[PDB]
Structure of Serine/threonine kinase 24 (STE20 homolog, yeast):
Amino acid sequence: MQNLKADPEELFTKLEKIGKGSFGEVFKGIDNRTQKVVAIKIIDLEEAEDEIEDIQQEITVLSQCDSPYVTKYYGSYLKDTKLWIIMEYLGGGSALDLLEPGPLDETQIATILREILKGLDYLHSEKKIHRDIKAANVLLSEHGEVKLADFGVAGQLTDTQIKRNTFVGTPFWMAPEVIKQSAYDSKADIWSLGITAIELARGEPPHSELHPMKVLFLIPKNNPPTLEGNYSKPLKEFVEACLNKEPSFRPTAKELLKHKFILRNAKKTSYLTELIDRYKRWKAEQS
Ligand SMILES: Nc1ncnc2c1ncn2[C@@H]1O[C@H](COP(=O)(O)OP(=O)(O)O)[C@@H](O)[C@H]1O
Ligand SMILES: [Mn+2]
Ligand SMILES: [Mn+2]
């Protein structure tokens, strides 16, 4: 890409490993001038096979986003056979990590959903579709802020290409129209958000115990998933609104920000530090 840079160690220092994605490794790093800690995702292009398309899309999309709800991009650097993607450091854990110690309460679910919705509204307003919304791609800072991550399969709508049709995403969270490879748009992310709402409430998405290939026919054919159990009616209705088989009947992210579930339960993001501290304790006491 046009603004690819070189000699990253002139400006940054690579520190300890903090994550592993699908293809590359993520490290903590630090800006040598401001001493601000950052995250560095390092990709070995020599290892890169047919995932290279996704690396270029990730950098392109990150570089074009400027929102408090999307991992901030600092730049991409070439270093021998590797590519360093430098981004905002988020040290609180992903929403999936934060589910490990135990269930969330409805205030936690509504607060995390509300922040994800602000990220989706930003992306959709930029004509971008994330296409891989799930708890593992929702990252929190150590202080409770919530941001969307992992843009390798994001789609871009344009003035003439008003729909996408590529089969991409993570099966359990994929909308029926994406699985069928029908023309789709940002509403596909609203279906994935409904699945993520169930994931935040139950700890796993519907069908999580089946092989993902099986869900390729269960999803289009079956009735949409619902949330059953001791959950407030508004949370079940928030899930139902998102999980409509007809995309045009799903609400937009902006409309969902005013859903009764969000309005009556979401609280300040700073309260999420209790959840972040629970994961830290949990992880330390872990056998
Ligand atoms: N900005 C970041 N700050 C802190 N940890 C991060 C950051 N980006 C990625 N990670 C760590 O890397 C993991 C996988 O990242 P992701 O973007 O989902 O990678 P991939 O495209 O290689 O699968 C995250 O789930 C997290 O544990
Ligand atoms: Mn991911
Ligand atoms: Mn990715």
Summary: Residues 90-287 form a domain with the Transferase(Phosphotransferase); domain 1 fold (CATH 1.10.510.10). The chain has ten helices and eleven strands. Residues 106-125 form the longest helix (20 residues).
